[PDB]
């Protein structure tokens, strides 16, 4: 676990998952690339989609 780094790039991240406020990324593309994997642990905080 790096200090404020992109979950994919490994360099640096500025954006944060708006759905869980946890995941961090440097861009929209990075979020989409990891998004597929992200759904494995995302969507279990608010529980709206059901």
Residue positions forming the annotated binding site: 6, 9, 17, 20, 26, 30, 38, 42
- Nearer to Zn ion by Cβ, of 26 and 40: the residue is 26
- Tokens 């640096």 belong to which residue? 12
Chain positions contacting Zn ion, by CB under 5 A: 6, 8-9, 17, 19-20, 23, 26, 30, 42
Q: Residues marked as binding for Zn(2+)?
A: 6, 9, 17, 20, 26, 30, 38, 42
Phi, psi dihedral angles at 32 (to 5 degrees): -70, -40
For the chain, count helices (H), then strands (E).
1, 2
Q: What is the C-alpha to C-alpha distance for residues 40 and 18, in angstroms, rounded to an integer?
A: 16
* Residue 11 CB, nearest approach to Zn ion (Å): 7
């Amino acid at each position: 676990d790096s200090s404020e780094s992109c979950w994919n790039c490994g360099r640096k991240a500025s954006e944060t998952c708006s759905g869980c406020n946890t995941a961090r990324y440097c861009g929209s593309f990075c979020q989409h690339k990891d998004w597929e994997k992200h759904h494995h642990i995302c969507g279990q905080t608010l529980q709206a989609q059901q």
